[PDB]
Write a protein that binds this DNA or RNA. Structure first.
Lengths: 105, 83, 97, 93, 97, 78, 103, 95
DNA sequence: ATCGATGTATATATCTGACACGTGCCTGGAGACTAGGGAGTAATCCCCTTGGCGGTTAAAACGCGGGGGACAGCGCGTACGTGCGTTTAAGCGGTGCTAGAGCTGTCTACGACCAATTGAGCGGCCT
DNA sequence: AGGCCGCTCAATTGGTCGTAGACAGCTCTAGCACCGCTTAAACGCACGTACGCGCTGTCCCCCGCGTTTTAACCGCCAAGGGGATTACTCCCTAGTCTCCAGGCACGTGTCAGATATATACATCGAT
């Protein structure tokens, strides 16, 4: 367990995040626990989105994930939609809905 | 070559398809000019920032990251063309 | 012959175009319009293709959102047909000059 | 030259989540943009929080409060728990 | 004499668009603020200027919302504002989903 | 309680907005939206206060919480 | 001082110190504080002269927040710049819709 | 005690420069201080972001000028650029 | 209300252009060490927040009578949707050319650090 | 709030050193332009009908005025919590050198999904 990620039990790189924090002009100094905490949070969010995207892809009998599945996963979940409410996804489309008054009677 | 009055290249059926994606069932005949004006204002607002970013770098081609930064500037983030 | 009553093909098109993800405007006219707009700022400019593609994506998303707001405004006034005043009200409430 | 990316880590996480699923190139581009955006937001809040209290260091406490400000309720709770668990594991070993 | 309805309303419209005072009583607002804050952390103390800033922001927000609501009400050919107008304004502005 | 926001106060707030005639059901809706707004701002302000290890909510905490939501406020030591 | 060399009223040294300490870049050029101070002084002079004109229009001798609010809102460029900003005790501008006006 | 910093004296000087026989209250002065700080942070942040985009480690007057052009509206930006360039060249000429 | 016209998701071949595995290698991350200063800790002072008493009186609550406005219903006529035939120019696939983004090398001028000095501006009281 | 007194701490001046970048050269990717061809999509026309819009009647529920009440605002007094400041020291991060392996560029095989298209089934509309 030489790499810091293996020590912390993560998949994302602790060292790269540390380097970016240092050479990003955020503070004079960076502590030793900020990269680990931030890498854990980023990995959690990525896994959370990918789970829903994979479920949506499996719903349509497809093996690979395309931007449509990412759009559907983000816009069907309340808090993921709230986080990314002002974000545009290329080739994502729109969520299918129709207002009631326009439906035939 | 000189370019003039190319706004009408955004034809009526294109406007109607954009409206149908938005859920519109019935469209008035005066919508198309309004939409063209709105689009022209939006493009003029974004391209100015893009060209400013281009001119700062002493560069003669407008790249994708200039457009992405410009869109970020009006609070209109876009994913898929670089970060 | 056979003729569908008005309002059916409109719903069919709504379903069709909400199902897909393609771009809805032709490419060459949009590229030509972008170059025409940009001429007014700096002369002899060049564009990457991905720049024009990003501009088209953003413009289409913006117009679709505006049309959704316009439809809401139209329904508020007990109508089905969208009119320019609906667009004006939507843009004024959203805070756009 | 060298261009940095998060493609390998995203692929590792995906293979942990769905072992029998692939991903396109465009979807991975969207993943890179999303990771960069969230990184920038959290780092900006941490910097502002450090500046407000007249401190020269960004610690994990600033990161925790930035996460607690940005993310909504259940998402923020789970993120805070994951970060604390990771820091405890790192410090213990 | 007896005023025809609608002229007194314009009178206080003119009166209240001319001043800059606060319109909500101060003690009830302070009690409401403390009661709301008890849910996040008990035994909290407040600077007076903090409560004044909260009141200023709340009054500005409510006045702007009422302007948008009146605009929506005029759009539907009415004179009276209704809850549906508030809902439509808040939906267009992006607050309510 | 939320009932301290009386009907005449809401009428004054509406009259500054130019509203001429008011329905009877506006008051409950206004109380609901005001309560939601206050909860959001106060939650952010208390977070800012608790990070600094204080027990008093200052004016700068409110200013920062408002600036966070795109509601910048001038006049309170910004 | 460096303010008299450029003929300014704002402090060049204070702006230089704020830019240096403010965590914006590794190094700060020599002419940045002068340019920035000149821009700030121009903007505040414009605001002040509009507010003073508004104050004299109301038959008063000193500026109050109401005058600043009126000056900002009546000027289109400054209203666009300070569009998401609330001035405390500033009030609103008097305007009633046409349909609401009495017949 | 605490030694707070403010732009009260410079604002007062500018006011007496443009309006000799006029005063100003404390509330308006505090609003002015808030406005000055707001614009300073906006310009500085945009300039730092511009410098970071192009892989430069320094902030010169070129970055400040471009940030001013990006943030202010047309005529206001033109006048601000004119004033800043005039001040910069006057400072350079003098020593 | 059966039935005829038209649209829609499905089964399958195929065929491909992109997804995923391999290998070389260089550039950035892991490991050990020192040295200085940021901040964690404990004490002290006094400012400002919380609590209570009583007064006058401004404003909220209640009730009633009356008219203005919201809403349902009716009828008409104009403007939009549908389908069909014709014209237009967009998209595809090549080719060739060259402008300008990009990398390498250097050497020059500019900004950071530091020691000493001073007067400009923040704090406090006045009219 | 405009003005004045006090002084102390941040702005001014000058010198040295290290390096960020301005400039010049050179290679090569990608943007621009042209040609022909096929057909997908835009244009124009005519008809019919369904929805936008005006008018009218009713009933209801908002507004304005007067009376009673209630608790907000004000002034004064008491007490203590906790915010702001100061001093000391210690341990945590920056900076340096060494060394090595993880990740990026180029190469390549083969397979999941986009087309073409016949078809059972859904759905709508006229007699």
């Amino acid at each position: 367990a030489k790499t810091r990620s293996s020590r912390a039990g993560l998949q994302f790189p602790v060292g790269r995040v540390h380097r970016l924090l240092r050479k990003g002009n955020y503070a004079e100094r960076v502590g030793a626990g900020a990269p680990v905490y931030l890498a854990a949070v980023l990995e959690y969010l990525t896994a959370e989105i990918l789970e829903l995207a994979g479920n949506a892809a499996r719903d349509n009998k497809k093996t690979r994930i395309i931007p449509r599945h990412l759009q559907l996963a983000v816009r069907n979940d309340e808090e993921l939609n709230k986080l990314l409410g002002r974000v545009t996804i290329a080739q994502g489309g729109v969520l299918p809905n129709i207002q009631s008054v326009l439906l035939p009677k | 070559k000189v370019l003039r009055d190319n706004i009408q290249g955004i034809t009526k059926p294109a406007i109607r398809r954009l409206a149908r994606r938005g859920g519109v069932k019935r469209i008035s005949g005066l919508i198309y000019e309004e939409t063209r004006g709105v689009l022209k204002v939006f493009l003029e607002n974004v391209i100015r920032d893009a060209v400013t970013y281009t001119e700062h770098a002493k560069r003669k081609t407008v790249t994708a990251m200039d457009v992405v930064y410009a869109l970020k500037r009006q609070g209109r983030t876009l994913y898929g063309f670089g970060g | 012959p056979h003729r569908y009553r008005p309002g059916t093909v409109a719903l069919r098109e709504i379903r069709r175009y909400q199902k897909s993800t393609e771009l809805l405007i032709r490419k060459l006219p949009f590229q030509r319009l972008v170059r025409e707009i940009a001429q007014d700022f700096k002369t002899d400019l060049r564009f990457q293709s991905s720049a024009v593609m990003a501009l088209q994506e953003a413009s289409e998303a913006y117009l679709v959102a505006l049309f959704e707001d316009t439809n809401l405004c139209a329904i508020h006034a007990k109508r089905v047909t969208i009119m320019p005043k609906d667009i004006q009200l939507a843009r004024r409430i959203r805070g756009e000059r | 030259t060298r261009k940095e990316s998060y493609a390998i880590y995203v692929y590792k996480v995906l293979k942990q989540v769905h072992p029998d699923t692939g991903i396109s190139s465009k979807a991975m581009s969207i993943m890179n943009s999303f990771v960069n955006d969230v990184f920038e937001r959290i780092a900006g809040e941490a910097s502002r929080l450090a500046h407000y209290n007249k401190r020269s260091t960004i610690t994990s406490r600033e990161i925790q409060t930035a996460v607690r400000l940005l993310l909504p309720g259940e998402l923020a709770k789970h993120a805070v728990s994951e970060g604390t668990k990771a820091v405890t594991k790192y410090t213990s070993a």
